[PDB]
Every structure is written in structure tokens, then in C-alpha cells.
Amino acid sequence: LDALPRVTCPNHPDAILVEDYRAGDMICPECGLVVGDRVIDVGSEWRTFSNDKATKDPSRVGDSQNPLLSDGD
């Protein structure tokens, strides 16, 4: 079970799958069989995605932490 791009259904090959925000489920249009295993939500983690800092505060916190570069002086 590794060929899971973004759509999959055990009964028929899925094609489209929406991402509901009011419920956080993978509702399928042509049937409705969800895929299960809900991780973090895209809408709930909007402000914590990509630019998950306090307005431009890179310094990349991985090894050589240096809060400067851009907008940090």
C-alpha cells in the first residue's frame, strides 16, 4: 500500500477528493468513502505553514541559529 498520491479508494480508483474545513474529513463526491488517518489540517495550520515565523524571522532554527539576515536587527 504505497501508491497513494492524493486520491485512493479500496473499491474504485479515486480521482478527486475535497478537503472540508468544517469537519476535517476526506469526503469523496462520487461515493463518500473517506481515506481515514487525519493529520494536521491545512486550514487550521494556515498561519503555521511555510512562513511560520513572527513576520520574517528565519535565522533557520536548525544548527547555526542567528536571528538576523532579513528583518531581525
Partner 1 sequence: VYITNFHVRMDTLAHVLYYPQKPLVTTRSMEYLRFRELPAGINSIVAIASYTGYNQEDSVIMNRSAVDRGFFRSVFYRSYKEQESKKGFDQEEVFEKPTRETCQGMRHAIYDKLDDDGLIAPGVRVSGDDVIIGKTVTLPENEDELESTNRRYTKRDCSTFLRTSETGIVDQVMVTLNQEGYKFCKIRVRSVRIPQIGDKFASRHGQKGTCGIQYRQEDMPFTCEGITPDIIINPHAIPSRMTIGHLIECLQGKVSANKGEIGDATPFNDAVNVQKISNLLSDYGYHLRGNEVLYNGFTGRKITSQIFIGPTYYQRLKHMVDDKIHSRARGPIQILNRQPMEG
Q: Provide the terminal-to-terminal Cα distance of the chain, rounded to the nearest Å.
A: 49
Query: Please, what is the minimum distance in Å from the beta carbon of residue 20 to partner 1?
Result: 5
> Considering only residues 18, 27, 31, 68, which one is a binding residue for Zn ion as defined by CB under 5 A?
31
Residue at grid coordinates 501508491: 3
9 binds, among Zn ion, partner 1, none (CB under 5 to 8 A by kind): Zn ion
Query: Among 13, 19, 14, 53, which Cα is nearest to 39's?
Result: 19
* Other Cβ atoms closer than 10 A to 3: 5
Query: Please, what is the minimum distance in Å from the beta carbon of residue 67 to partner 1?
Result: 17
- Contacts with partner 1, residue ranges (CB under 8 A): 18-25, 38-44, 46, 49-51, 55-56, 70
